[PDB]
Write a protein that binds this ligand. Structure first.
Ligand SMILES: CN1CC2=C(C(=O)N1)[C@@H](c1ccc(C#N)cc1)NC(=O)N2c1cccc(C(F)(F)F)c1
Ligand SMILES: *[C@@H]1O[C@H](CO[C@@H]2O[C@@H](C)[C@@H](O)[C@@H](O)[C@@H]2O)[C@@H](O)[C@H](O)[C@H]1NC(C)=O
Ligand SMILES: *[C@@H]1O[C@H](CO[C@@H]2O[C@@H](C)[C@@H](O)[C@@H](O)[C@@H]2O)[C@@H](O)[C@H](O)[C@H]1NC(C)=O
Ligand SMILES: CC(=O)N[C@@H]1[C@@H](O)[C@H](O)[C@@H](CO)O[C@H]1O
Length: 215
């Protein structure tokens, strides 16, 4: 996250770090005790048996007893199309269930087909590049936009300054009115261009599919 701020520790206890050999590569959202959701581009070309799913983290540079670590049991995809930048969503079934506590919660999702209007106020977040790469979870105020956005995305823009999501933020949730409406998918013009909006996978478009998998 470029131009964001440090989150309060454990403020977004649904927030997940996907790791390989101890290092963060992507975000995710805990959507049930035994399922996370992320971006499909996060796990394209990745050894998913190597993937560690880290719950309850805040400061990645630190040893944290609040953490719960899982492996990936199964993956579920929904027609990922990298060429057309479509269906950038994956569900990763964990090898065990999370212990739901202060530090580890299941996110709330929107109703199916719920569209967000121009001007909706959201919170983007993640452990991606800062413009270094972040130790402490970052968050950022973003506004939903329809210009320079396709109907197959929710797009956001910070107005009046250059800020937005960046590399390592891939797969991270976009929280809008307390619901996960986005999964960070792609940027244009580099990170934080002040020109192109950030594009997210539109979670509301995939709710019936998500529900079917998690119950
Ligand atoms: C490097 N990584 C990130 C990446 C692409 C990629 O293929 N891998 C690649 C990409 C290609 C297809 C689809 C689809 N559908 C989504 C992303 N293009 C791209 O813009 N990013 C990227 C860079 C910075 C931030 C973000 C994010 F946080 F917004 F998600 C994504
Ligand atoms: C589920 O897996 C947890 C983490 O396993 C570790 O990470 C994966 C990606 C591999 O590298 C693996 O060799 C590591 O052991 C375990 O800590 C946890 O006990 C597992 N839960 C089960 C089996 O119920
Ligand atoms: C910055 O965002 C703050 C927190 O955002 C609110 O809560 C999160 C969980 C999301 O639901 C988001 O939709 C909400 O707006 C706000 O309290 C604050 O008003 C925002 N400030 C500006 C000017 O955008
Ligand atoms: C999570 C959070 O900070 N939500 C806030 C809310 O508490 C406050 O009433 C409002 C102020 O405009 O902005 C939103």
């Amino acid at each position: 996250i470029v131009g964001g701020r440090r989150a309060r520790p454990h403020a977004w206890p649904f927030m997940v770090s996907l790791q390989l050999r101890g290092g963060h590569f992507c975000g995710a959202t805990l959507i049930a005790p035994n399922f996370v959701m992320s971006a499909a581009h996060c796990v394209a070309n990745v050894n998913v048996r190597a993937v560690r799913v880290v719950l309850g983290a805040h400061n990645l540079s630190r040893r944290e007893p609040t953490r719960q670590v899982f492996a990936v049991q199964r993956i579920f995809e929904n027609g990922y199309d990298p060429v057309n930048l479509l269906n950038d969503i994956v569900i990763l079934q964990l090898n065990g269930s999370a212990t739901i506590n202060a530090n580890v919660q299941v996110a709330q999702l929107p109703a199916q087909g719920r569209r967000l209007g121009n001007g909706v106020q959201c919170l983007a977040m993640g452990w991606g590049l800062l413009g270094g790469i972040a130790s402490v979870l970052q968050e950022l105020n973003v506004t939903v936009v329809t210009s320079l956005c396709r109907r197959s995305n929710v797009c956001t823009l910070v107005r009046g300054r250059q800020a937005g999501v960046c590399f390592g933020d891939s797969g991270s949730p976009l929280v809008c009115n307390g619901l996960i409406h986005g999964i960070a998918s792609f940027v244009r013009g580099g990170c934080a261009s002040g020109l192109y909006p950030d594009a997210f996978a539109p979670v509301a478009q995939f709710v019936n599919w998500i529900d079917s998998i998690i119950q």
